[PDB]
Design a protein around this ligand. Sequence first.
Ligand SMILES: [Zn+2]
Lengths: 119, 71, 130, 207, 125, 108, 56, 102
Amino acid sequence: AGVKAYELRTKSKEQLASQLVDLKKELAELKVQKLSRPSLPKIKTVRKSIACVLTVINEQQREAVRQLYKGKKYQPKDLRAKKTRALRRALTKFEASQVTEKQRKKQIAFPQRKYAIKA
Amino acid sequence: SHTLCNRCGRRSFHVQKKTCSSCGYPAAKTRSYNWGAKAKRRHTTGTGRMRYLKHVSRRFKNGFQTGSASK
Amino acid sequence: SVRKRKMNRSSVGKATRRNKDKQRKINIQSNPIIAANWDYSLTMAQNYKKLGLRAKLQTPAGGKETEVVKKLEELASRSQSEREEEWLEKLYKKHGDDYKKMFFDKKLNIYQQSEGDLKRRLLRWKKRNG
Amino acid sequence: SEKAGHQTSAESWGTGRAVARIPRVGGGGTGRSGQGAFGNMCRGGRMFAPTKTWRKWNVKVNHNEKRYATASAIAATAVASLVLARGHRVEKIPEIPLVVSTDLESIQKTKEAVAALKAVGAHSDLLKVLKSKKLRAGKGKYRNRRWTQRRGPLVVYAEDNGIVKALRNVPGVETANVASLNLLQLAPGAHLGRFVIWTEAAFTKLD
Amino acid sequence: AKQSLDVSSDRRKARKAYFTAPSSQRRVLLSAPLSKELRAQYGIKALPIRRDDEVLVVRGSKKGQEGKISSVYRLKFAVQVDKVTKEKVNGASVPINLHPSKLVITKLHLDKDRKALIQRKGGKL
Amino acid sequence: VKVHFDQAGKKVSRRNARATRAAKIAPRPLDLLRPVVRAPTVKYNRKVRAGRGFTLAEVKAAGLTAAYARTIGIAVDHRRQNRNQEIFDANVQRLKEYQSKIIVFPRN
Amino acid sequence: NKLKRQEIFADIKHEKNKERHTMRRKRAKEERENPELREQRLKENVTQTIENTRVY
Amino acid sequence: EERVGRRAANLRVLNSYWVNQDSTYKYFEVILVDPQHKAIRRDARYNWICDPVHKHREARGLTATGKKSRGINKGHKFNNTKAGRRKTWKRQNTLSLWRYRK
RNA sequence: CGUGGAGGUCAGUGACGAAGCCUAGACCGUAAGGUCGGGUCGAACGGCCUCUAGUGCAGAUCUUGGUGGUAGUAGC
RNA sequence: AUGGUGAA
RNA sequence: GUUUGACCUCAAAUCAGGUAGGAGUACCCGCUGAACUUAUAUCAAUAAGCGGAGGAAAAGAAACCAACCGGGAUUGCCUUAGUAACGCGAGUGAAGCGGCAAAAGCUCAAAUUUGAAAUCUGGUACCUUCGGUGCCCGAGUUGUAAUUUGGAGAGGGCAACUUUGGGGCCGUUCCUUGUCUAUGUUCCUUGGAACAGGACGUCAUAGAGGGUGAGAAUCCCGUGUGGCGAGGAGUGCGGUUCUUUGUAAAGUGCCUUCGAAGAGUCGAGUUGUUUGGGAAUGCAGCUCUAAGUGGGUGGUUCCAUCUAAAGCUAAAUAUUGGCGAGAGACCGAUAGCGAACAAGUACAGUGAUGGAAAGAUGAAAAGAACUUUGAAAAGAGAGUGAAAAAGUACGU
Ligand SMILES: [Zn+2]
């Protein structure tokens, strides 16, 4: 068997670091004993556990960074979206929909009407 | 006569001229000409790995959605 | 196409899309009455003729009241600010109905409005009061 | 493909080499070097007179000639001997041309439609289809042309109320309107006298 | 005759899709009919076949043989049934590959997911 | 060499676009109201054809202003002048018929 | 790939045949040294002829 | 315009005018608009320049001087060059064929 | 006369064997070619009216591929 | 002819 | 005041907020650009090279076309038309009108808000965050806020004038996406295997298609029609509503007073380029350089049309590149893209570059257990498989 992400989600940073250190030590010991046996499948399991622990730690760090950057604009680029280079620029919806006073007055005075031509 | 090129490693880096006769290194623009259709094909996008360009089409199909599922 | 061959060979998976059927299938979404009566089986011109609504005002190129009453059925189906009301009250119980005198009221008529505008505003205020 | 053949790079050695003057590929080591190219006689070379997209595909036909052909095809359907010579099993039809009551157009279920067709002597024609189903002969088996079958009876209606959908699934049977009366359906393979099952409304509207 | 324009009646496309279909799709592909006795019970004709299910062979040289499925070979588009093996000349026993479409299910291995699927498919339990 | 192999495809695309426009524009007749115009060049001086839009004078005579007329799907031309008092009368009659035959829904 | 399949299995057959030949030679030498081993092997190995495998 | 645009890549060329001249040099004043600035982006009268289609207008000759140099104007004076000097070659050198030959 | 494909047609042929190939087998036609007798073969093809062409080889110091005399010779 | 490569 | 501070200019910051490089390149927009090929003409405003964006690009609402009873953005097709015109040979070669597809018009400059720079960038605290409010600072008066582009337009008075915005919720439209929705495996013959023939049943708005030991509607996956969901885009619209705000804004007719239009620009001159263009129009260097009842474009001694030297705009339009789909009277391993397979791979070249050969066992490896001659390779027995006259050198 192996560790589960949801189980680690309920552990503090220090506990996650200790678990990561223990798993790394176990992986190193297994690697030192790799030639002792023809094949030990537990190496893959411990590697997957280490990867999951690292992912959980990175997620916690990123959530903390987001929390400490809450509210203020111009947040670090990494936390921003990754749509594409072209879509980031070019008149975001509010700027695109902006209308001058004259055009707004003309639209309000003479808005497009719905009608039918039989009677 | 020639050495491996850092940009492409084609072994076409002229020591005397300190430039690559294939990709044009260290020129800013990668060397390529219309008459060299075979040369263009040999270096056309897709021959390599396309680490980021591969998933662009898949991401667009989802509208560049951001977040996570709701279960 | 080198890119097409790589994509087909790659295990990433094509972002498959299917919208050919929806090109022919169009849903009317500009009127509730028409939507409940529109027949997708018939063509746009055929549906317009069935509902009685003209499709093309000009003569169509080439060769060639059941529901209209519903639209006609639905076809047949301001206030003054507190400060403005107070100012009109001062005009009233300073001059009454003599708009000519009110036109020269420097103290109350801060803005030199015409007699017609003053009388119209006074009538509007009266309509909502005694 | 236009680029076919011309992709290879080759040049003519010329006289003095005691070999054919056909252009040959340059280079060496790959084996392809020295191989002839740029010729319909050469393997992998450009084919003589490559086929081009701008070949005349469609053929213009006079409208009056089309109307005459359609009228002749329709008239050929009223002759039992001519229809029999077309291969349709009309030996047991009550009358020719066959006219059915207008209620036929209102049939929705396929079972009812096929039962009605069988009851009017069209059972033999229907059975003719689904028995001649044979695999395509030649290279057309793998070009979306695997299966071929004999044409079934044709049903003509003044207006559609479900008959077209009812008879769509049954093999061989085809449905058409009086306004169109497709010549291809009427006379498949440039052959006159197809078995057509008309309707009272369609018969009246034909006038 | 097809009516939707989003479905292609091309032999080449169907052949390419079938051979390159993923395991998840192959699970739907590897479906076998249920015995009429079970059909009256659950009111369902065919269900996906899994290892724990018991099936009966009704086609091929091994007709009339029934047993539990040892494994589901999705890669080879075949399944293996217990007691259905080919005895090699060396004494080894090799299970005989069988397509699920040629086998009739005599018993079904019930589970929460299996019961949910049966209910979703209009069946009764 | 260019060959129009997409004639049927182009026709289908145009029909689909018109159907989509009708779906988006259900009550209006997919277009505006055009005037009657006499063609020039002698050879066509005796031919009457649809124009771009009614003149300002025609719209004013019809009983409505150009700004409001444009919202009722009436084409208005600000550069076309009136010189013969028969096409003007025909256009006025056409505009009156259009006004009589139109039903306008309220804003709310 | 046809060439890959042909080449890979061609080498495998040669190695298998060489190993079988060496094993058979060593077994023959040991049987010459110890004939009883040949009898023990024969008592457990049968040619499994069609006649010997009658199905009653 | 091209010289100023190349150096000021982030800027967009809007127009230019003459200011002074010399026996050895001629001086022109060029106006450029920064589409990145939020003031221009939120300005309806000028937010159109932010569209990517208007990138390097002077390079494609879309400016007042560029359009004039292309001979794009209404009148018989520019009939032969109404829509450029390149598309005409494609128009005249293309043999149009229909499904049913005319 | 013959072939690639298509519309029609024989409710055609065919795992009780379709195509191809071989045949010191015969039959039919002046011929292009077609039919059948026998062996291998295994899963498509043909009788006939039309449409269609990348449609028929004895050579082009022809192209791709395969095999001989020279020759177990010169030669290493 | 155009675009590039090398060099007692 | 022998002194301080402002305006203007010039530099530094690993200061805060921002952007351009390149790749791709079939289509577009500009510069540049030859020869073979044919008797300045012509290949040819082509090939190649250079710079710039997109899903289309340019152009686009006349200093237009016309001399008619006048038409009224640009764009693409037919037609005009192989005509005018040029060259007068060879040949090149348009455009108005007419029909079709689609139609949306607008944004600045120019006359004082002056009884109130009322405008906006940026920092900060909050909120209902593609943003909103309060405060602060700066940009701006060498002009940011209202209106107007001759189609005029503006300041006032009279209609017993007319009219009015903002934000959520669910529905509705679209995108992604999961799922349900009919019928034999009945009998006989043959076959290794029935998916083959005959007999008897059933569904068909589902007999397109694929797989299952050989041609399967009824074995499965699937197709026809409908049903049930989940996550996103959006104000295209129907309700539900919470707000409205203020002597606030807009539209029509009448009466009065005003009433502003783009200069090294047109044009002439001169030197090169472009067209088959006779009024080189158009574009390119430069001496010169104008008026506002004016100027441009034309035909007749007068009249006809427009208002250039500023800009934006979806539509019909192109597409051998990209993503994703539907098809072929197309080729079928010497064919078809060079590449059906370890194909731009092996391989050759100091390098720009060139560049192939290679598909199929058998249904299932059941891939020959075991004996035996064999430096190693192959055989002889024996055996699976319908076939080894299918041996991983395998469809014939
Ligand atoms: Zn390089």
